[PDB]
């Protein structure tokens, strides 16, 4: 009608994204970034995740992990990926083993390069934020993106690292902080975790439920490490976006502020609490909750059939027998 619908950190930003699409921003997935409210963003995302998800790609990836040979498995990568531990997780795990009280926060001394980042690259300002609960959940979401990226890439960033992270993160590719629809069941943290999984089975190179789950376990570990370990990850995420001459924009509208805010207003108790909260939700989940609407046709328009990811593996393994049998 008139006014743009603000987005990003505390809904302060506009225009920036819209402009970036003319400049090669292919992370954004909103059809109309400047004129789409929070609820409509959900509607739009959920529907687009369905069109994006590819079951034939999903089953291929599963079958390879379970039934492919030594050769096909090494081309794919999945077995190695699942053995891998990101540098940040690894220094938490190391603290854990040595510590006689695994329940405390983990002491971090920020590196010289990290001190420099915090002076130079982040906004210096106070943050009056009344509504901080969507900011923590964004942290929860973005960490999953990061951890997934570290695993899939085995510790070394690449020229699509920001794209991978931005895709797995609903607050970035869809500017969506609400996550849960409202119209006229489940925790918000439980949705964030389901969203992470569903996107990790539709967008990246490796689409694998175990992987998604592994990435989430590692998120819980970093959280348990405490605020200072979360900041260390936030700093890496931030750089990966800043260093990109197109996607730097997501620092502008979201990560610039989010990391600066977190450094000063970030609570240690809220972090730990989020950690134990998200672990419960993750552990209450199974393949049965991961549903996608997939396509079968109809002529008398396309008709969607709903099936969870476990149903897809049984139909695969069932038809796999007929192939192994008949010839």
């Amino acid at each position: 009608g008139i006014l743009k619908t603000k987005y990003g950190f505390d809904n302060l930003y506009d225009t920036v994204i819209s402009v970036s699409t003319s400049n090669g921003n292919d992370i954004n997935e909103l059809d109309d970034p400047e004129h789409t409210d929070a609820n409509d963003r959900v509607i739009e995302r959920l529907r687009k995740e369905n069109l994006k998800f590819d079951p034939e790609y999903y089953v291929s990836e599963y079958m390879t992990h379970k039934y492919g040979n030594e050769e096909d498995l090494e081309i794919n990568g999945i077995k190695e990926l699942l053995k891998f531990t990101p540098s940040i997780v690894k220094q938490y795990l190391q603290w854990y083993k040595d510590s006689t009280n695994p329940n405390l926060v983990m002491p971090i001394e920020f590196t010289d390069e990290e001190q420099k980042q915090m002076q130079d690259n982040l906004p210096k300002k106070s943050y009056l934020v009344e509504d901080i609960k969507p900011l923590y959940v964004t942290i929860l979401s973005v960490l999953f993106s990061y951890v997934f990226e570290q695993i899939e890439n085995e510790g070394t960033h690449t020229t699509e690292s920001a794209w991978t992270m931005g895709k797995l993160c609903p607050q970035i590719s869809f500017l969506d902080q609400q996550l849960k629809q409202v119209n006229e069941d489940s925790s918000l943290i439980k949705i964030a975790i389901i969203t992470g999984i569903r996107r990790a089975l539709s967008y990246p190179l490796h689409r694998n439920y175990d992987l998604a789950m592994k990435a989430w376990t590692f998120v819980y570990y970093i959280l348990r490490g405490g605020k200072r370990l979360v900041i260390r990850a936030l700093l890496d995420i931030h750089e990966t976006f800043r260093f990109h001459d197109v996607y730097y924009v997501y620092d502008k509208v979201l990560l610039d502020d989010l990391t600066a805010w977190f450094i000063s207003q970030g609570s240690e108790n809220v972090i730990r609490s989020l950690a134990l909260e998200m672990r419960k939700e993750q552990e209450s989940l199974s393949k049965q909750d991961i549903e996608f609407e997939c396509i079968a046709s109809f002529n008398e328009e396309p008709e969607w059939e709903t099936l969870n990811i476990r149903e897809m593996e049984i139909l695969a393994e069932s038809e796999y027998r007929e192939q192994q049998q008949n010839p």
């Binding site: 090494e74 059939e305 695969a316």
Partner: protein, 357 residues
């Protein structure tokens, strides 16, 4: 004999082989044997820009004429230049960044503001301004260093006070500054009278340079007679801009990973070019000769021959789409099979597929 094959496929048997075992995935087409919509979408026109409407307006005209999602282009430094403008269409836009940082050659007419007391002086001041030069942008304008690799005075007419010369230079070098600088170095003062760009990166005015009139015709001819041959001749496939680069062909199975930015590993290696030095910029290609990505090599050809494990190349720039080569197990539409499980029972009480055997 394979030295008759088009573009990136020239001299394919002059690539040192690695693996013998593999199976060709039906997806994708070779660059020359692409089909219209996607040929155009990997398209590149070496345009002779007319001396007038700005580079952006002209590209806009190409967009309106062809009708396509995106167009970008090789460089804009001077607005009245004629000559090579490489207009990229759709997926080819992926390569404009490189095309813009690509070396450019010019033919320039300088206007001196008074007659030189020694004609031979210009050639000398031109010779003076080669290699790393200082240069501040003309009419946000910071002093930078640009290199002029070679120049050459072609012709000088002291009475008319006009000189015509060639310069080869780093991207970002301004010819209208160059002209002002000769002006100052000669005392009489000077400025750029006119300019023509004779090469932009891997494309010179000799390599199939077409005009806006050709673009309009080629499009008219399809829209009215459905013949493509025209349209398909003015548009060269992006793989053109990559002939110079050394080549690694990638196993069909490993292609998609490169499209997501992942390293290329030994298991994924199929063939390699001789004399590839550690850190070179290489192109990675399908066996159909499609450019997957431009990559930084990580293993010398000698290493690439003897190595059991190891990473071969990191991706500098993804060109190819993400799910062009998905690795389908070729089972059968999973969703569609659940429609037939409603149509025949066998589905459980809750409507979900039975874990049964």
């Amino acid at each position: 004999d394979t030295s008759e094959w088009p573009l990136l496929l020239k001299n394919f048997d002059k690539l040192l082989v690695r693996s013998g075992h593999y199976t060709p995935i039906p997806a994708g087409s070779s660059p020359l044997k692409r089909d219209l919509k996607s040929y155009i979408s990997s398209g590149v026109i070496n345009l002779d820009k007319p001396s007038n409407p700005s580079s952006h307006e002209v590209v806009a005209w190409i967009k309106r004429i062809l009708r396509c999602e995106k167009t970008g282009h090789s460089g804009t430094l001077d607005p009245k230049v004629t000559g090579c403008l490489i207009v990229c269409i759709d997926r080819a836009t992926r390569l404009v960044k490189s095309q813009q940082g690509a070396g450019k050659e010019y033919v320039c007419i300088v206007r001196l503001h008074d007659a030189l007391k020694d004609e031979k002086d210009l050639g000398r001041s031109l010779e003076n301004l080669t290699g790393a030069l200082f240069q501040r942008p003309p009419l946000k304008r910071q002093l930078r260093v640009r290199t002029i690799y070679e120049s050459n005075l072609i012709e000088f007419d002291n009475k008319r006070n006009l000189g015509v010369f060639w310069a080869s230079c780093e991207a970002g070098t301004y010819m209208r500054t160059l002209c002002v600088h000769l002006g100052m170095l000669l005392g009489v003062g000077g400025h750029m009278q006119e300019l023509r760009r004779v090469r932009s990166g891997a494309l010179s005015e000799n390599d199939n340079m077409v005009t806006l009139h050709d673009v309009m015709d080629a499009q008219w001819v399809y829209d009215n007679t459905r013949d493509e041959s025209y349209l398909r001749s003015i548009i060269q496939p992006l793989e053109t801009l990559l002939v110079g680069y050394k080549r690694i062909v990638v196993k069909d199975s490993a292609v998609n990973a490169v499209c997501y930015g992942a390293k290329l590993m030994i298991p994924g290696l199929l063939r390699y070019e001789e004399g590839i030095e550690l850190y070179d910029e290489i192109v990675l290609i399908t066996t159909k000769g499609e450019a997957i990505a431009v990559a930084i090599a990580q293993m010398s050809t000698v290493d690439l021959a003897s190595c059991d494990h190891g990473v071969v190349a990191s991706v500098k720039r993804c060109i190819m789409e993400r799910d062009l080569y998905p690795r389908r197990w070729g089972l059968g539409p999973v969703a569609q099979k659940k429609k037939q499980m409603k149509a025949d029972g066998k589905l459980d009480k809750y409507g979900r597929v039975n874990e049964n055997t």
